[PDB]
C-alpha cells in the first residue's frame, strides 16, 4: 500500500499521490499558523510571529510578503520554499502587468501559482514546494478577494480560511463564525481573525507575536499594520 | 425502540435525509446522540443532540486533501 | 428566587450547577449543595432528577464527625421521595438509618418518633423474606417497650 | 530510511531529510560568529589548523563578496568557496545591471534562492555550508544575514554558526550591541571566540577578524594586525 | 504482479499497463459527474460540494467552456483539470487560426486525447489523473465524448464518472431515452447526480452546463435553483 510513496509521478493502487500528501504534511513543518478573513469591504491576514531568539532582527522575520502594490500574500510552511514561491508570484504578476497592461487579479496570481505547482506535480523534475500561499487583493467589481494555493496546485477562493499546524481548529472556528450573519466591518474582520488565532492558540497575543496584513476597498494597497495598530486592535478586542 | 427518546424526536427527519449511511452509521448516530444527552445531564434524548450526532457522524471527508475530491 | 415563590425557577437555576466538577470545593459544602438540589427538586416534584441526585451522593459520608444534620436532612428528603413513590421498605430502611444516628438517639422524643416511623413503615411493607427479616430485627429491640401500642 | 536518499523526496511526516542532514553537517564545523555593532558588522571566525604545515591564512573562511560585503562561511569548505563565487557573481551582475552596489538584503535573498534551488532536485545535493553576509552603508546602516543549507535567510543582530552556536549565542545576548561601535565589538567577538573554542578537542586554532563599517568607510576588510593582536590579548586576559 | 505497477513504459507479463489503470482508479475516486446527450443537445452536470462554507463556491467553476460551442466537465484530480482545459482551449484556438472555423467536437476530443496520451508514453511523467466529458454542437447534431488518461476516447450517449459511477449508469438506461429534450436532459442529469449526492442540492453545490445549438453555456445558479425546485 505505502510502497508507492517515493516518486511524485507514481499513482498508488488506490489512485493516491502520496508525495503531494507528504508536501501537505510538510506545510505544518513551519510550526506557525495564518488566518485570512474576507470582510464586506476588506481582507485581513494574521500570522504567528515566533521569534524564539532575542538576537534575530524582528523586522526580517516577517512571513507577510507584498507580491504587488495591491496584492499581498502570507506564507505558511518552509521559509525557503515560501520565499521562492513569493518571488515566483511577484515575477508572474510583473509579467502579467507587462504583457496585458492592467494589474493581475489575485484570481490569476493563485491560478498561475497553482499551475506551476501542478506542473511540478506531474513532471518528476522538481520537488513540490511545501508552502501554502494566501493572497489578498481588492479586485474591482468583485471587492476584496482571498485565495489559497497549496503544493498540489489546487487554488480556491475563500470567505475565510487558515493554514498551518492549527488549520482544522481555525477553520472550524471560522465556520462557526461565518454563518451568523453580521456586518463584516474592517474592525470586525480584524477582530474575527485575531479571535480565531487566539482561540486556537490560547495565547494572550502580545503585539510582537503576531503580524497583520490588511487590504481595504478604501485604499486597495497591501498594508502591514504597525505594532501600535496591533495593540489598538487587541485592546479593542479585549473590551 | 430501546432508547428513552422524546416526543419531539422525529426519526423521519433523519430517515428522509439523502445521505447514504449504513446500519453501523445508524447505531453510531443513536449512541452518540444518547451520549450527547447524557453529557448535558439529561435522561431524555432531545432533537438537538440527535441533530448534532447526525452532523458529527455524517462528516466523513476528514482531510480529503481537497484535490482528489 | 425561592424566597420570592419562584420555586421552579430556583430549582432550574440550581440544577445546572454541577457540584462534582468543582474538585476544590469542600466535601461537606458539596454535599450541602447536593441536598439543596434535592430539596428544590422535591419542591418542584421532579422525582426522576431527585433519584439521579440521590445516585450522585455517596452513602459513606454520613458516617463522619459533623455530618449529623446532613444525614438527617438527606434521609428526610429520601423518605419524602420514596413516600411519593410508595416503596415502604425503602422508607423503613431510611427511617432505621435515621434512628441509628447518635443525635436522634440522644434526644428522647426524636428517637421515639424515629422508632414509631420505623415500625409503622415496616408494618406497611408487603410481606416477603426481606420484610420478615426487618420485622424480626426491629422486634428484637429493647426500646420498643417505651412505645407499648407500637410494640403490640 | 527509504525517504532519505534524495532531496526531492518528502518524508511521510513532511520533511526533506537531505536538507536536515546538510544542516547537521554544518553543525560539525568550527564556530564562526557575526555581530553588527552600532555602525558596522564584525565577523570573527575560529579556524582549526588541522596541520602545522598550513601557512597562516590558509583556508580563510572570511570571503569578500563585494567591496562592502563580507562572508563568514561555516561548514564544507569547497561548498563555501563555490557559494562565495556564486555570491560574487550575483553582486557583479547586480552592479552591471543597476549601476550601484547591491543591497545586502537583496544579495542575501538571491544567494538564499541559489542555495534553496539545490534542495529540490535529485541530481544535485543541498549545499553543505551555512554562511553569514555582513555589510554597512551610510544609507542602509549595518546589516547582517545568515543563510543555512535550507536556504532560509533573515537578518540577525548577532549570531553564530558551527559547533558551538548555542554556547556563543549565550555570550552574544549579554552584549548591548545596539550601542557600542565595532572598535570594542572586535575584542568582545575575540573573547567570545576564545571562550567557545575547545582547546582540548580542537587543539590549536587561529582567530580571523573582519569588519565593515563607518570606521572602514563602508568597505569590508580584514581587521589590521594591531587590532587583532589587541583583541587576542583582551581575550587571553579573561582566563579567569 | 506488483513489480510492474511502477513503470509507465513496462508491459506486465499479462500485458497490462498497470499505472494507467491506477490513474483510472483515481478518476473513479473523484467527484461524481454525469453527461447525457438528448436530441436537442448535451447536458453536463457535476457535484461542486465544498468541504465547508468557507470555500468560495463561485471562485472556481468545474464546468468550463473551450469554445463558444464546446464545453467540458471532468472527474478525477482537480489541478490536472485546469491543465487539460488550457490545452483544450489552446488547441481550439490553433484550429481556429488554421481553418477560420470553430473546431469540430470530434477533432477537439481527438487532439485532447492525444495530449493526455503524451503523458503516458514516458517515465518520470504522470498520466492525467482525470477523465473529461466533452460536449459540442456541430452540423445540427449534439456530440458527447469521454476522454481518458489512457488517451482512449469514446462517444457516450449518456454516462457518469467519478464516485458511484456504477450507480449513475444503473440509474441511466432507465430514465434515458434517445428522443428526449434539453430540459428533460437537465432533469435526468440532476436526478442521476441525486442518486450519488450526499445532502441537499443547494444551487451552489451543483454545476450544470448545456451544449445546445446556440453554443455551450454554463447554467447560472438561478437556473440551477429553478430546475432543482422543478425536480424536488
Provide the residue count of chain B. 69
CA–CA distance, D181 with D184 (Å, rounded to integer): 6
E227 and E185 Cβ atoms separated by less than 8 Å: no
Residue of chain D nearest A23, judged by CA positions: D14
CA–CA distance, D66 with D221 (Å, rounded to integer): 10
Domain layout of chain D by residue ranges? 1-238
Using the beta-carbon criterion (under 8 Å), do B67 and A21 form an inter-chain contact? no
From B20's Cα to the closest Cα of chain C, the distance in A is 38
CA–CA distance, D54 with D59 (Å, rounded to integer): 9
φ and ψ at A112, to 5 degrees? -70, -40
Please give the resolution of this entry in Å, rounded to 1 decimal.
3.1
Angle at E116 between CA E115 and CA E120, to 5 degrees: 115
Please report how many Cα atoms fall inside a 13 Å half-sphere around the Cα of residue A201, on the Cβ side. 24
* Closest-CA residue to C87 (of C128, C137, C26, C59): C128
D4 and D17 Cβ atoms separated by less than 8 Å: yes
Residue E82 makes CB contacts below 8 A (sequence gap 6+) with A111, A114, A115, A118, A153
Tell me how far CA of residue C72 lies from CA of C38, C67, C95, in angstroms: 13, 9, 10
From A59's Cα to the closest Cα of chain E, the distance in A is 32
- CA-atom Rg of chain D in angstroms: 18
C121 and C95 Cβ atoms separated by less than 8 Å: yes
Helix pair A106-122, A79-100: axis angle to 10 deg: 120
A168 and E43 Cβ atoms separated by less than 8 Å: no
D146 and D161 Cβ atoms separated by less than 8 Å: yes
> Is D114's Cβ below 8 Å from some Cβ in A?
no
> Is A150's Cβ below 8 Å from some Cβ in B?
yes
* Closest-CA residue to A15 (of A6, A26, A4, A28): A4
* Closest-CA residue to A35 (of A187, A148, A191, A197): A197
Return the exposure string of D141-179: e unless at least 16 CB atoms fall within 10 Å of the residue's CB, then b.
ebbbbbbbbbbbbbbbbbbbbbbbbebbbebbeebebee
Residue of chain B nearest E74, judged by CA positions: B69
CA–CA distance, E128 with E11 (Å, rounded to integer): 19
CA–CA distance, D144 with D42 (Å, rounded to integer): 9
Angle at D104 between CA D101 and CA D110, to 5 degrees: 100
Q: Which three cell numbers stand for residue D33?
A: 560568529
Where on the phi/psi map is residue E100: left (φ > 0), alpha (ψ -120 to 50), or beta? left
Domain count, chain E: 1
Start-to-end CA span in chain E (Å): 48
DSSP code per residue over C10-50: HHHHHHT--TTT-TTS-HHHHHHHHHHHHHHHHHTT-HHHH
Using the beta-carbon criterion (under 8 Å), do A20 and B66 form an inter-chain contact? no
3-state secondary structure A111-124: HHHHHHHHHHHHEC
Q: Which three cell numbers stand for residue E76?
A: 478525477
* Closest-CA residue to D62 (of D84, D41, D38, D79): D84
Residue B58 makes CB contacts below 8 A (sequence gap 6+) with B19, B21, E198
* Closest-CA residue to A83 (of E215, D147, E178, B39): D147
Check the CA dihedral C83-C87-C90-C92 and report its sign: positive
Using the beta-carbon criterion (under 8 Å), do A13 and E22 form an inter-chain contact? yes
CA–CA distance, E117 with E129 (Å, rounded to integer): 12
E strand or H helix that includes residue A230: helix A227-238
CA–CA distance, E73 with E90 (Å, rounded to integer): 17
CA–CA distance, D27 with D44 (Å, rounded to integer): 17
CA–CA distance, A224 with C99 (Å, rounded to integer): 77
CA–CA distance, E97 with E101 (Å, rounded to integer): 8
Using the beta-carbon criterion (under 8 Å), do D13 and A25 form an inter-chain contact? yes
Angle at C141 between CA C137 and CA C143, to 5 degrees: 150
DSSP code per residue over E153-200: EE--SEEEESTTHHHHHHHTTTS--TT--HHHHHHHHHHHHHTT--S-
Tell me the CATH number for domain D1-238. Answer: 3.60.20.10
Q: Which three cell numbers stand for residue E120?
A: 503516458
- CA-atom Rg of chain B in angstroms: 14
Indicate the burial class of C16 (C-beta count within 10 angstroms; 0-12, 13-18, 19 or more): exposed
Q: Residues of A numbered 98-137 whose beta carbons fall under 8 angstroms of chain E's beta carbons: which are they? A: 107, 111, 114-115, 117-119, 121-125
Break chain C down into helix, strand, coil percent, rounded to 5.
70, 0, 30
Q: Which residues pair with A123 in a beta bridge?
A: E125
* Closest-CA residue to A213 (of A51, A116, A61, A72): A72
Q: Given CATH 1.10.1060.10, say whether it is the number of domain A1-239.
A: no
- DSSP conformation class of C125: S
Return the number of CB contacts < 8 Å for B and E. Answer: 25
Which stretches of A44-203 are DSSP H helices?
A: 79-100, 106-122, 167-177, 186-201
> Is B43's Cβ below 8 Å from some Cβ in C?
yes
> Is A16's Cβ below 8 Å from some Cβ in E?
yes
Q: For residue D153, list chain A residues with Cβ-Cβ distance below 8 A.
A: 83
- CA-atom Rg of chain E in angstroms: 18
Q: Other C-beta atoms within 10 Å of A164: how many? A: 24
Q: Which three cell numbers stand for residue E219?
A: 447554467
- DSSP conformation class of A60: T
Indicate the burial class of C108 (C-beta count within 10 angstroms; 0-12, 13-18, 19 or more): exposed
C15-21 long-range CB contacts below 8 Å, 24 or more apart? C15/C40, C15/C41, C15/C49, C18/B41, C19/C56, C20/C56
CA E156 to chain centre: 11
Please report how many Cα atoms fall inside a 13 Å half-sphere around the Cα of residue E86, on the Cβ side. 10
D74 and D29 Cβ atoms separated by less than 8 Å: yes
Q: Which residues pair with D121 in a beta bridge?
A: none
φ and ψ at B5, to 5 degrees? 55, -160
A161 and D43 Cβ atoms separated by less than 8 Å: no
A211 and A226 Cβ atoms separated by less than 8 Å: no
Strand order in the sheet with E41-47: E158-161, E33-38, E41-47, E206-212, E215-218
Helix pair D182-196, D165-172: axis angle to 10 deg: 140
CA–CA distance, B57 with B62 (Å, rounded to integer): 11
The torsion of the CA quartet E93, E96, E101, E102, rounded to 10 degrees, works out to -10
Domain range holding E225?
Answer: 2-231
3-state secondary structure chain D: CCCCCCCCCCCCCCCCHHHHHHHHHHCCCCCEEEEEECCEEEEEEEEECCCCCCCCCCCCCEEECCCCEEEECEECHHHHHHHHHHHHHHHHHHHHHHCCCCCHHHHHHHHHHHHHHHHCCCCCCCCCEEEEEEEEECCCEEEEEEECCCCCEEEECEEEECCCHHHHHHHHCCCCCCCCCHHHHHHHHHHHHHHHCCHHHHCCEEEEEEEEEHHHCCCEEECCHHHHHHHHHHHHCCCC
Q: Return the residue matching grid coordinates 506535480.
A: A121
Q: Other C-beta atoms within 10 Å of E2: how many? A: 10
D214 and D40 Cβ atoms separated by less than 8 Å: yes
Start-to-end CA span in chain D (Å): 48
Helix pair C129-139, C108-124: axis angle to 10 deg: 150
Residue of chain B nearest C52, judged by CA positions: B43
CA–CA distance, E191 with E203 (Å, rounded to integer): 14
Gaps in chain D following residue numbers (C to N > 2.5 A): none
- CA-atom Rg of chain A in angstroms: 18
Residue A96 makes CB contacts below 8 A (sequence gap 6+) with A103, A104, A108, A112
Q: Which three cell numbers stand for residue C7?
A: 420555586
D44 and D172 Cβ atoms separated by less than 8 Å: no
CA–CA distance, E197 with B29 (Å, rounded to integer): 20
Q: Other C-beta atoms within 10 Å of A219: how many? A: 12
- DSSP conformation class of A137: E
D88 and D65 Cβ atoms separated by less than 8 Å: yes
Q: For residue D116, list chain A residues with Cβ-Cβ distance below 8 A.
A: 80-81, 83-84
D79 and D129 Cβ atoms separated by less than 8 Å: yes
A30 and A78 Cβ atoms separated by less than 8 Å: yes
CA E219 to chain centre: 16
Residue D109 makes CB contacts below 8 A (sequence gap 6+) with A83, A87, D153
> Is C48's Cβ below 8 Å from some Cβ in B?
yes
A233 and A187 Cβ atoms separated by less than 8 Å: yes
Q: What is the CATH number of the domain that holds E204?
A: 3.60.20.10
- DSSP conformation class of E55: B
Strand order in the sheet with A160-164: A160-164, A33-38, A42-48, A210-216, A223-224
CA D201 to chain centre: 22
Return the SS3 of B51. Answer: helix
φ and ψ at A191, to 5 degrees? -60, -45
CA–CA distance, C87 with C93 (Å, rounded to integer): 10
E strand or H helix that includes residue B58: helix B47-58
Q: Which three cell numbers stand for residue E226?
A: 429553478
Q: For residue A126, list chain D residues with Cβ-Cβ distance below 8 A.
A: 8, 120-121
Amino acid at each position: 500500500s505505502a510502497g508507492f510513496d517515493r516518486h511524485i509521478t507514481i499513482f498508488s493502487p488506490e489512485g493516491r499521490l502520496y508525495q503531494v500528501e507528504y508536501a501537505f504534511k510538510a506545510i505544518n513543518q513551519g510550526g506557525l499558523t495564518s488566518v485570512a478573513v474576507r470582510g464586506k469591504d476588506c481582507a485581513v491576514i494574521v500570522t504567528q510571529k515566533k521569534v524564539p531568539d532575542k538576537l534575530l532582527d524582528s523586522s526580517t522575520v516577517t512571513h507577510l510578503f507584498k507580491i504587488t502594490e495591491n496584492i499581498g500574500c502570507v506564507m505558511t510552511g518552509m521559509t525557503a520554499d515560501s520565499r521562492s514561491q513569493v518571488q515566483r508570484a511577484r515575477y508572474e504578476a510583473a509579467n502579467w502587468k507587462y504583457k496585458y497592461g492592467y494589474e493581475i487579479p489575485v484570481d490569476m496570481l493563485c491560478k498561475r501559482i497553482a499551475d506551476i505547482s501542478q506542473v511540478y506535480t506531474q513532471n518528476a523534475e522538481m520537488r513540490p514546494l511545501g508552502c501554502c500561499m494566501i493572497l489578498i487583493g481588492i479586485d474591482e467589481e468583485q471587492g476584496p478577494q482571498v485565495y489559497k494555493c497549496d503544493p498540489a496546485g489546487y487554488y480556491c477562493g475563500f470567505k475565510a480560511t487558515a493554514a498551518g499546524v492549527k488549520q482544522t481548529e481555525s477553520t472550524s472556528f471560522l465556520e462557526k463564525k461565518v454563518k451568523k450573519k453580521f456586518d463584516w466591518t474592517f474592525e470586525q474582520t480584524v477582530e474575527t481573525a485575531i479571535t480565531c488565532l487566539s482561540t486556537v492558540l490560547s495565547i494572550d497575543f502580545k503585539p510582537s507575536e503576531i503580524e497583520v496584513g490588511v487590504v481595504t476597498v478604501e485604499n486597495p494597497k497591501f498594508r502591514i499594520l504597525t505594532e501600535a495598530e496591533i495593540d489598538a486592535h487587541l485592546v479593542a478586542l479585549a473590551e | 425502540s430501546k432508547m428513552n427518546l422524546s416526543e419531539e424526536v422525529d426519526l423521519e427527519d433523519y430517515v428522509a435525509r439523502p445521505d447514504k449511511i449504513s446500519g453501523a452509521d445508524i447505531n453510531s448516530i443513536c449512541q452518540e446522540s444518547g451520549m450527547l444527552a447524557v453529557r448535558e445531564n439529561r435522561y431524555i434524548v432531545l432533537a438537538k443532540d440527535f441533530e448534532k450526532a447526525y452532523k458529527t457522524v455524517i462528516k466523513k471527508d476528514e482531510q480529503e486533501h481537497e484535490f482528489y475530491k | 428566587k425561592e424566597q420570592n415563590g419562584d420555586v421552579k425557577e430556583a430549582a432550574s437555576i440550581l440544577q445546572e450547577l454541577q457540584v462534582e466538577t468543582y474538585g476544590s470545593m469542600e466535601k461537606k459544602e458539596r454535599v450541602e449543595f447536593i441536598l439543596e438540589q434535592m430539596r428544590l427538586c422535591l419542591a418542584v416534584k421532579d422525582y426522576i432528577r431527585t433519584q439521579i441526585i440521590s445516585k450522585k451522593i455517596n452513602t459513606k459520608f454520613f458516617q463522619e464527625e459533623n455530618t449529623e444534620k446532613l444525614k438527617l436532612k438527606y434521609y428526610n428528603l429520601m423518605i419524602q421521595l420514596d413516600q411519593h413513590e410508595g416503596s415502604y421498605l425503602s422508607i423503613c430502611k431510611h427511617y432505621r438509618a435515621i434512628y441509628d444516628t447518635p443525635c436522634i438517639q440522644a434526644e428522647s422524643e426524636k428517637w421515639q418518633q424515629a422508632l414509631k416511623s420505623v415500625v409503622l413503615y415496616v408494618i406497611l411493607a408487603p410481606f416477603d423474606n426481606e420484610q420478615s427479616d426487618l420485622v424480626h430485627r426491629i422486634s428484637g429491640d429493647k426500646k420498643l417497650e417505651e412505645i407499648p401500642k407500637y410494640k403490640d | 530510511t527509504g525517504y532519505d536518499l534524495s532531496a526531492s523526496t518528502f518524508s511521510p511526516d513532511g520533511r526533506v531529510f537531505q536538507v536536515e542532514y546538510a544542516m547537521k553537517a554544518v553543525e560539525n564545523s568550527s564556530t564562526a560568529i557575526g555581530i553588527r555593532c552600532k555602525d558596522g558588522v564584525v565577523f570573527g571566525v575560529e579556524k582549526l589548523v588541522l596541520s602545522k604545515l598550513y601557512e597562516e591564512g590558509s583556508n580563510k573562511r572570511l570571503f569578500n563578496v563585494d567591496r562592502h560585503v563580507g562572508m563568514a562561511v561555516a561548514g564544507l569548505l569547497a561548498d563555501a568557496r563555490s557559494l562565495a563565487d556564486i555570491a560574487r557573481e550575483e553582486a557583479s551582475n547586480f552592479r552591471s545591471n543597476f549601476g550601484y552596489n547591491i543591497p545586502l538584503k537583496h544579495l542575501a535573498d538571491r544567494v538564499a534562492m541559489y542555495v534553496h534551488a539545490y534542495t529540490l532536485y535529485s541530481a544535485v545535493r543541498p549545499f553543505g555550508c551555512s554562511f553569514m553576509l555582513g555589510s554597512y552603508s551610510v544609507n542602509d546602516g549595518a546589516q547582517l544575514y545568515m543563510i543555512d543549507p535550507s536556504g532560509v535567510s533573515y537578518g540577525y543582530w548577532g549570531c553564530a554558526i558551527g559547533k558551538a552556536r548555542q554556547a556563543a549565542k549565550t555570550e552574544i545576548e549579554k552584549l548591548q550591541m545596539k550601542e557600542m561601535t565595532c572598535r570594542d565589538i572586535v575584542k568582545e567577538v575575540a573573547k567570545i571566540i576564545y571562550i567557545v573554542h575547545d582547546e582540548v578537542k580542537d587543539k590549536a586554532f587561529e582567530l580571523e577578524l573582519s569588519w565593515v563599517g563607518e570606521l572602514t568607510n563602508g568597505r569590508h576588510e580584514i581587521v589590521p594586525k594591531d587590532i587583532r593582536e589587541e583583541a587576542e590579548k583582551y581575550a587571553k586576559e579573561s582566563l579567569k | 504482479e506488483r513489480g510492474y505497477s511502477f513503470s509507465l513504459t513496462t508491459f506486465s507479463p499479462s500485458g497490462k499497463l498497470v499505472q494507467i489503470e491506477y490513474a483510472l482508479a483515481a478518476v473513479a475516486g473523484g467527484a461524481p459527474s454525469v453527461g447525457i446527450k438528448a436530441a436537442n443537445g448535451v447536458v453536463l452536470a457535476t457535484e461542486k460540494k465544498q468541504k465547508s462554507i468557507l470555500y468560495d463556491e463561485r471562485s472556481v467553476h468545474k464546468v468550463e467552456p473551450i469554445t463558444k460551442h464546446i464545453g467540458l466537465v471532468y472527474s478525477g484530480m482537480g489541478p490536472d483539470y485546469r491543465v487539460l482545459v488550457h490545452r483544450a482551449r489552446k488547441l481550439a484556438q490553433q484550429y481556429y487560426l488554421v481553418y477560420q472555423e470553430p473546431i469540430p467536437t470530434a477533432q477537439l476530443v481527438q487532439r485532447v486525447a492525444s495530449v493526455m496520451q503524451e503523458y503516458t508514453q514516458s517515465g518520470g511523467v504522470r498520466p492525467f489523473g482525470v477523465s473529461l466529458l466533452i460536449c459540442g454542437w456541430n452540423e445540427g447534431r449534439p456530440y458527447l465524448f469521454q476522454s481518458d488518461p489512457s488517451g482512449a476516447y469514446f462517444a457516450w450517449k449518456a454516462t457518469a464518472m467519478g464516485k458511484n459511477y456504477v450507480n449513475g449508469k444503473t440509474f441511466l438506461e432507465k430514465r434515458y431515452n434517445e428522443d428526449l429534450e434539453l430540459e428533460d436532459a437537465i432533469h435526468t442529469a440532476i436526478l442521476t447526480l441525486k442518486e450519488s449526492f450526499e445532502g441537499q442540492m443547494t444551487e451552489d453545490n451543483i454545476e450544470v452546463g448545456i451544449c445546445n445549438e446556440a453554443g455551450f453555456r454554463r447554467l447560472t445558479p438561478t437556473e440551477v435553483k429553478d430546475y432543482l425546485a422543478a425536480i424536488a
